[PDB]
């Protein structure tokens, strides 16, 4: 048993201005309790933005840092990220098992979680990532990873990834809306959908979030 994030919907907050990011996040907080913060916001406004969001909104924070370095550097990135208050960090699987294990070790030390990114949602993912993705997922299973990221834009791939990681793993999925993925279809396989632009570029982000949730009401 694992509790769903609110409405199975995670906000990808990739606005690069603190005031805009705070405005939109506050506007959709009644619908979303889990926010993904990545480098567009962090490199513009600083790591302190993580604790600020956590305090102001009382939301979960996933640091989407696509950690993709050697083990020693990965350990340092993870430590800094958890010190900043992130609940979880997203790590690339493609650099291999030692790089992932380094992140898992720090997460264990600090009482936090790692999400393993398997296949990516964009067209370029077909070149190198897709062919390795099943094996990346199996590596995750072998390492004891319980949380995964896979692509809304390829539900047949998402289904295959779900098959590899099992029903007990937690799977979140970006590529919904702007990149062409469908909320309902994605939630056949993923526990939660990640949505950025379709919400944060909307004239009314709250209405956009509400509309997405309405379209998946029967899956909640």
- Is residue 37 within 8 A of residue 17, CB to CB? The reply is no
Q: Is 178 annotated as a binding residue?
A: yes
User: Is position 138 annotated in a ligand binding site?
Assistant: no
Q: Does 38 bind ligand BMP (CB under 6 A)?
A: yes
What secondary structure letter does DSSP report for 177?
S
| Measured CA distances, 74 to 65, 186, 215 (Å) | 10, 30, 39
In angstroms, the CA 33 to CA 8 distance is 9
Q: Which residues sit at the interface with a copy of itself, rule CB under 8 A?
A: 14, 16, 38-40, 42-44, 46-47, 65-66, 68-73, 76-77, 80-81, 84, 92-100, 120-129, 132, 135-136, 139, 179, 197
Residue 92, binding choice from ligand BMP, a copy of itself, none, Cβ under 5 to 8 Å by partner class: a copy of itself
Under rule CB under 6 A, residue 182 binds ligand BMP: no
Shortest distance, position 27 Cβ to a copy of itself, whole Å: 21
Q: Which residues participate in catalysis according to the annotation? A: 66
Other Cβ atoms less than 10 A from the Cβ of 109: the count is 12
Do the annotations mark residue 182 as ligand-binding? yes
Is 131 known to sit in a ligand binding site? no
Residue 177 interacts with which of ligand BMP, a copy of itself, none, CB < 5 to 8 Å by class: ligand BMP
Name the one residue in this structure whose structure tokens are 């949602």.
121
H or E element at residue 192: strand 192-195
- Helix (H) or strand (E) segment spanning residue 99: helix 97-110
Consult the annotation and say whether 155 binds a ligand: no
**3 vs 127, which CB is nearer to a copy of itself?**
127
Take residue 156 and report the two structure tokens written for it.
């047949």
- Of 73 and 159, the one with the shorter C-beta distance to ligand BMP is 73
Partner that binds at residue 161, options ligand BMP, a copy of itself, none, CB closer than 5 to 8 Å by kind: none
Please name the residue ranges forming H helices in 29-86. 39-45, 48-57, 71-83
Closest separation in Å from C-beta 36 to ligand BMP: 6
- Give the contacts of 85 (CB within 8 A, at least 6 positions apart): 50, 51, 54, 61
Q: Nearest approach, Cβ of 72 to ligand BMP (angstroms)?
A: 7
Of 151 and 155, CB closest to ligand BMP:
151
């Amino acid at each position: 048993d694992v509790m769903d994030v609110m409405n199975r919907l995670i906000l990808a907050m990739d606005l690069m201005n603190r005031d805009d990011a705070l405005r939109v996040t506050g506007e959709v907080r009644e619908y979303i309790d889990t926010v993904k913060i990545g480098y567009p916001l962090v490199l513009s406004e600083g790591m302190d933005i993580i604790a600020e969001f956590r305090k102001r909104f009382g939301c979960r924070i996933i640091a989407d840092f696509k950690v993709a370095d050697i083990p020693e550097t990965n350990e340092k990135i993870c430590r800094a990220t958890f010190k900043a208050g992130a609940d979880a960090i997203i790590v690339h699987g493609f650099p291999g098992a030692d790089s992932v294990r380094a992140c898992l070790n720090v997460a264990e030390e600090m009482g936090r979680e790692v999400f393993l990114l398997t296949e990516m949602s964009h067209p370029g993912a077909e070149m190198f990532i897709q062919g390795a993705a099943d094996e990346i997922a199996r590596m995750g299973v072998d390492l004891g990873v319980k949380n995964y990221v896979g692509p809304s834009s390829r539900p047949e791939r998402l289904s295959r990834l779900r098959e590899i990681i099992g029903q007990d793993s937690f799977l979140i999925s970006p590529g919904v809306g702007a990149q062409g993925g469908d909320p309902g279809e994605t939630l056949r396989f993923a526990d939660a959908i990640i949505v950025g632009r379709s919400i944060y570029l909307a004239d009314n982000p709250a209405a956009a979030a509400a509309g997405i949730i309405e379209s998946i009401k029967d899956l909640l």
